[PDB]
Amino acid sequence: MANFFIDRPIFAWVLAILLCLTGTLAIFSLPVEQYPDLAPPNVRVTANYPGASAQTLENTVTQVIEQNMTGLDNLMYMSSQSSGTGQASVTLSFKAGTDPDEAVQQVQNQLQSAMRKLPQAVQNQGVTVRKTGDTNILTIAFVSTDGSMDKQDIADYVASNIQDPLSRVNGVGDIDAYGSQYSMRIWLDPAKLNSFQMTAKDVTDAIESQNAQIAVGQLGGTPSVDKQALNATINAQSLLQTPEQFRDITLRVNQDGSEVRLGDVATVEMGAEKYDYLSRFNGKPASGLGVKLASGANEMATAELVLNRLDELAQYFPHGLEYKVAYETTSFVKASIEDVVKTLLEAIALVFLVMYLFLQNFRATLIPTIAVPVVLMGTFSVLYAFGYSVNTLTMFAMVLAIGLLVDDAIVVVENVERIMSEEGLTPREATRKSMGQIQGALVGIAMVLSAVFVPMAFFGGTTGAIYRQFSITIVAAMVLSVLVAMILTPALCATLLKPLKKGEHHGQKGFFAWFNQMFNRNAERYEKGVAKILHRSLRWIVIYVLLLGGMVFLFLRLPTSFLPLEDRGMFTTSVQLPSGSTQQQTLKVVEQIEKYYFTHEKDNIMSVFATVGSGPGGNGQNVARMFIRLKDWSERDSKTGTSFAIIERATKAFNQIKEARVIASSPPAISGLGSSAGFDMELQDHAGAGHDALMAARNQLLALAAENPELTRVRHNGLDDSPQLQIDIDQRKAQALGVAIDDINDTLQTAWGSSYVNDFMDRGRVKKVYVQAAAPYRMLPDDINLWYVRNKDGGMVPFSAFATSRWETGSPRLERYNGYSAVEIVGEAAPGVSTGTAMDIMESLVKQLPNGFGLEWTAMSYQERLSGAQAPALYAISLLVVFLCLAALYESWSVPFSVMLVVPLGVIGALLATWMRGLENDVYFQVGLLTVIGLSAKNAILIVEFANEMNQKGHDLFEATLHACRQRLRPILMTSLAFIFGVLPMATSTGAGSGGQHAVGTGVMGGMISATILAIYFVPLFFVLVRRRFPLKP
Amino acid sequence: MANFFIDRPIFAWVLAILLCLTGTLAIFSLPVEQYPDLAPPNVRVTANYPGASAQTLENTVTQVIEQNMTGLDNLMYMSSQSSGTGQASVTLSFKAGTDPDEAVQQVQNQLQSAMRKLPQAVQNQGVTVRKTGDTNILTIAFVSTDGSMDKQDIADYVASNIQDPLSRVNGVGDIDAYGSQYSMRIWLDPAKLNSFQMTAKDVTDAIESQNQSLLQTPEQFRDITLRVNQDGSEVRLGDVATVEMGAEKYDYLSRFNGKPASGLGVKLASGANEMATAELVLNRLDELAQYFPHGLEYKVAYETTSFVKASIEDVVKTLLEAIALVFLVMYLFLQNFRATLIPTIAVPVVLMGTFSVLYAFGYSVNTLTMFAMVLAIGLLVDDAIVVVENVERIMSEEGLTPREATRKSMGQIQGALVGIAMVLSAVFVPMAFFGGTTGAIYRQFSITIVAAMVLSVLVAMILTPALCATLLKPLKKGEHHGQKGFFAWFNQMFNRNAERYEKGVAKILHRSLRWIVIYVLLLGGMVFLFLRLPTSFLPLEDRGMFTTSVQLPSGSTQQQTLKVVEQIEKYYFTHEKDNIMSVFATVGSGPGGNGQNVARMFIRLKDWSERDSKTGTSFAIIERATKAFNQIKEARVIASSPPAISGLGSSAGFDMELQDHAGAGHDALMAARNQLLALAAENPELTRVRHNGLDDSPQLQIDIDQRKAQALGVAIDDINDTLQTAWGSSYVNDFMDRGRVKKVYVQAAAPYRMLPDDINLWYVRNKDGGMVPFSAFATSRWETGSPRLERYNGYSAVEIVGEAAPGVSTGTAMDIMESLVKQLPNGFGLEWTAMSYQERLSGAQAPALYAISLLVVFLCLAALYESWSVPFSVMLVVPLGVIGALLATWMRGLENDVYFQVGLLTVIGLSAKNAILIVEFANEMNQKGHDLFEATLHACRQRLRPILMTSLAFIFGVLPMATSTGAGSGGQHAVGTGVMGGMISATILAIYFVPLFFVLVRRRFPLKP
């Protein structure tokens, strides 16, 4: 095979160009994203029980749904919430890798059975099963520059002209609006309704009848008269437009001729929602839009399309109105991708430099350099074939691959160079002899570097997904490298390499002469040291045992984590005032926070966008969210301008604040995994005690977490108990009075909340018509008698007759996790503390809690625990696979055992590097450790294969291994330094996702350094000891 | 390999027989169709909101569905229509190659979320998601010869006895009816109603309560007792109404050759074969015809199988003529009959192997595959011709035996055959990877030609050496030439011309500089011709049918449209009597929409044999009609040919969507539409530019004030019910007719629902039971509304369709339309759809295809011959063929369409073939050590005859295509002309330039040793 392409260089060039072209086509047709999926598919079930208390809703609907949904295939955990507004939601998070459509189908199938057990009112209302989505791509703030357009006017214009077209952009699953358009709201006064003996149902029916558009046929229908002139459609009536027309709805005509107009019994206004969001941008009134990513779509492409359309719409904006990007994800993605590309290019440059250092000839340096683009573009082609994308994980895998893929080419080139220098052969003959000598070595190196990354793909969960990204990439790179090393590189060595060795051009005075002298002296000293340690076995055996002990000690000592957080240039601060606080108090707190960010962080904040209030449908106005976008990483300082610092300073300043709970939290590492960064914990109530006991336990846990300095920003992801109305309707009592359940339910909705009747045309735009009770009347336990629902006989039966209301204090939102009443508690570790340590502290604290309360990590915390548990298996399986492959290749059990003894030498170095740098045992460290295992195996192989060949030929074991070390010292050193300087840009990257680059690079670089400086001595020791223990048959 | 089959010919014969048998098996089991599945799949979501205006329907239903359907995988574009009748449809077109079933399933899944958001009435009606067939395979008109049955009689029979059986026929997706079954129509009389003091609601309530035990005859309905007086006298329905057995829907009025008739529109189920389904349907109809009442007979008004069958037969004829011409030219160069037969035997073997490959891949016998076969016929014989020519030359010069000559020849030309197969197959490989309809077309040709090339090389290395060693007579010149007639003169002329050619090649080699400037001029001319050449997607074909559509001003009645229809029928019967077989008009149906002001007319021309070749062409008669129809100012009448691809578009020409990007409103959009139409009418490069929709129609809006309505104690529901019953139609109950359950409708009589003031003739029953006139609480008012509202990709849009003027390509027309849209007021933009979108896609993707194909050929040659010099010498001759292809296309008048693109690829392959046939021998001789000039001159001298015969075989193979006159003449011309010109130029220029390129490259890069 090697000789075939040695004699046919053009064929090898053609194959290389084919690979390059396929890669170039793939690169321009590959989607770009930060992380590929990595999020378990969640399916949400939503049910509504109007006028139902939280406890009643949970008991009647939520628990039934939970019971029926148990037994789903690949289900991971269930999270459910029961709200006081009458809406119940049960989120079903499935195992990662599961197709969302199948999960939705199964959920719907079980909901078919579950529905009949639900209350009939809920069944009539409807139950929805949809994939969650819930990934806010960007938040857009619309602010009036001139100030001419009022905040309500801005909200109306946005919801009328901007929300509709943006909702139809590809990949836009949902677009939340932080402002409500104008609507024909009618405020019923029950005093007037009772005065004229008209119920709310009469008003609703009259509005339906008198505001409608019905087509009644055609003027000049098809069976027409002999000679007609027109064929026109006929409409019964038209939709009301002005509020005055609504005030003229008749509702009755008395025998005297008096009419009870709608304006006489109620008040109509073309206003907005009662409790619409009080959104602000940079201290100015504004509206907002929250664009969410549709499940299974590219965030970058969707954001580009959305922004583009917004630009188009902007062209036709009213004067003074302009949009602002208050929140954006694509920035970081682009910055991180470009930074990793720069790191890859610098890695290629450093590999070229080190190869040129070892190989003075420029062509001899080019020959392995040409392998880099070919293998890289082939890897891109393979990624395109398997449907992968250009993400951070794949680019990290590519940068890690660079050194491994150039290893075989370097080995071939330097073997050819050594043969040319020593035996004085022609480049073609030297290349042929080199291929004959080291055909086995290339295969062994590729096997060891690819066998490590095979078992990873099989693992499941998000961790498995991350591993797979690296596996596919690295395995494809290794396969192409071993293919390139036996196809392209031999031809390049045969042709490009001039016979300058015969020309005796070597010997030029300069830096390279000094380098060669130093290398020769060090090689002689190294061989002497190898001989000495082979004579003095026991001392270095003891040293190896000590190294094993140190490796175990560092493995136990190293803190653990899942993924390093990155400065995305953005963070969110959440404000939660004491329950019952008005919107104005929350606004004042928000203003204080805005002032703090404007004066203290003036050099870093680009824009702050606040969203006061939970919204028109929200129960409380004491909750606000503040989207903060920092300036470009470049502009912000690298020491104090970092989000992590800014967040720490803000956290101290906000803990100083006692008016309300204010927490500044960075966005989560993975978009779909969780809500915010840090650990996520559910405080389950296993004993089944009361909700008050759970609340007391939650308060105690929060106090204990505040006590611990290792924990910071610990908060409850929920709402505190507040007084809430419980309008209870006695169906038997009502039907005894002969009053329809539907009518009383509609009246309850109209009074307690809002009722949608129909649409009306405003300026050519259809807008909804809402009928609501007057401001003082909200179906209080006091005014429930004021409302009447006339029975079938027509008698106005008072609502108080068949129903009762009471102000009962309780939790507005009841949460239930995996069939236990639980409160979700989230928080972050203190600076210098890993997430795993924080989780251990939280477990200790929950142990300190009264018995019956347990914890169960969810989302990112759950998958971090999964990865931590599965890591030892991953290593064991990878080591076993490597050992088996080595045994198969060399048809022996002594050689692989000799090789596998070198793995601790690299593992100790990786552990030391990560420990000294201050990093932690996260997913990246785990993938690194596997790379270090493969690299140590490669370094051991380079010596043991040659020594074993010499032994099988019959050479003396001691002399054979000494000769092997003498010959292969240069290959090990240069294939090692190529990788060490390949990952050097990663370990020293600045900006973008520098955190992930550091986490990946540092461990592998340290592991490589230790692997070389220890293997070049210990590998002879292990091989000699094993062969003496188990000599060959001859 | 070759020597093995030379020693064992029986095994080669067995392999050839196996290939032939497999091909014959495949031919009989391959579907026959015009085109493969080229049209992108479409999924239509229909929702029917009864009693809703178009604007309300769009606001409440169409927009919700559009919002929810966003996010579908492989979605090209989304189009929706909101009709004033109350039916909304959203058409989702996915990328070509997407599985229709997967698309439908995904649409249904994503619709489930949208179901609750829709208005309750819409949900109760039920939204339907189904594949969009929308391909009228067969339009049957039923007419009564004796005149015994009226239009309704015919319609009922059709609906009762014919529509149902044909629906169950396999492959029939939908069967549209241009008529409706009977329905016991009850025409109310307001004067009679007032005389007896009864409202329309009383009649409706009585009838709905009258009811198996259902009334049968109208006389039973006339005796229905509405009420009984105290005196014992009763008021019957006949006293107050006129009951007759009419139609449930009076929408359509169909005429066949001026005679009343009813029609059926048969639509193809997705995936079904068109020809087989049409054959099944017609057969079934004939069976049903066995029981037709006297006089009633069905007549086909629109059929596609005729043109498909005729085109396939024509392509088979041109294929056979190509084989004959290839045999003739080979016999011209190879005077021996057996030497001519040996490559001829390869043609059936390779063809049947290609058919077997097509069957294995699941392809079918369509026009594209057949064109590819015809091209391959010239292509495939190349290797066999080379082998036979080399054997003949060895036998003539060395005098060896046929076995020894074949054995020497195979070793001599082993490389040449592989190179020829590589170059003729590497061009068509990348083309297959392109997507869309264009990609599909490309793939058809690729799969066919690549399989043919592989099989041709296999036959050349297996079967042909055995034939040469056995069939060829050792006495090649036992009686010398043996012909002193035409063959002797031809041989003398060829020898003299070959000597002149060699001398000229030597002269051109000596004078290198002069001809390099000529090559640069040829490059410049090639670029200029490529830029100047107009572009298109596919050639239109005379399919024997065309459709004219009538659209009167909005508000026109059915009779007014019928008058224009009769005028058009008179025009067709007078001016186009000798070319038109039949015309089938359907008042009330139109491509833009349905209404009394729109009519669609189907015209079937006579067979191509009867119609004149110059003045009887579909294009010519259509142009004459458009010249005549533009004089008609009563209505907008446009005669259009069927689209090139059935599922791609509604009609031929371009198809754009003028959409409102600024949301200026519907009125601004209509004003822009009118301005654009005026501009298009002004331009002479455009013709038949029309709006594929309905203009705003007058609407009579009733205004009821509720104060006086409630003052008189009148319910709004009652006044709406009376209005619907009188002006519209009320479905009271059912009645059984001849064992069939049919509807009963109540409506006001014609004279009493014909003017706006007729509202005052009706009365409503108040709470007290009194009669209140409508004039008391109702006033009418005229307004204006849009019967049908269209949206495209979210934006409100109006679909503008049209055709380029004769002599103008579709690409030029699209550019003109883009300029006109630019002339429109700001805020309006355009987006090409249907075939026009695919045309733009192909035009964008063509340069990539060319570059990638050229690169692939270069790399394959470099790998094969292990030298960069050889492909660079070869690839320099590609422009020499491209210039000829462009020149032939420009001279004939064709354009740069898909066929031209596939041709250019074939021309590249052929130029590479000739360049290989020279440079392979030249390079081998130079490698041996021979002088470069001597080597190249010897290569030219030896390979002139193989090149000339392998090229004449191809040119005369494609000559029948370029001169065809059958059904699919346009496509055959488009395919054949460019390739024929490219081959001609490639030969007559390469045979001189290839030596120059090779010598120049070798002198610049001399072989080291």
Numbering used by the authors:
A (entry chain B): 1 to 1034
B (entry chain A): 1 to 211, 237 to 1034
Publication passage describing the model:
The Escherichia coli acriflavine resistance protein D (AcrD) is an efflux pump that belongs to the resistance-nodulation-cell division (RND) superfamily. Within the HAE-RND class of membrane proteins, AcrD is distinct in that it is a specific aminoglycoside efflux pump that mediates resistance to a variety of aminoglycoside drugs, including amikacin, gentamicin, neomycin, kanamycin, and tobramycin. The AcrD efflux pump is a substrate/proton antiporter. It works in conjunction with the AcrA periplasmic membrane fusion protein and the TolC outer membrane channel to eliminate aminoglycosides and minimize the toxicity of these drugs.
Surprisingly, our single-particle images also indicate that AcrD can assemble into a dimeric form. It is interesting to note that this dimeric oligomerization has not been previously identified among the HAE- and HME-RND families of transporters. The structure of dimeric AcrD depicts that these two AcrD protomers are nearly identical and display an “extrusion” conformational state. Superimposition of a protomer of dimeric AcrD to the “extrusion” protomer of trimeric AcrD indicates that these two protein molecules can be easily superimposed with an r.m.s.d. of 0.9 Å, suggesting that these two AcrD protomers depict a similar conformational state. In comparison with the overall structures of dimeric and trimeric AcrD, it appears that the assembly of dimeric AcrD is distinct in that the second subunit of AcrD is located at a position that is much closer to the first subunit, indicating that the dimer interface of dimeric AcrD is narrower than that of trimeric AcrD. Based on this unique structure, the dimeric AcrD structure may represent an intermediate that this pump must go through to progress into a trimeric assembly. Three-dimensional reconstitutions of these particles allowed us to obtain cryo-EM maps of trimeric, dimeric, and monomeric AcrD at nominal resolutions of 3.09 Å, 2.95 Å, and 7.66 Å, respectively.
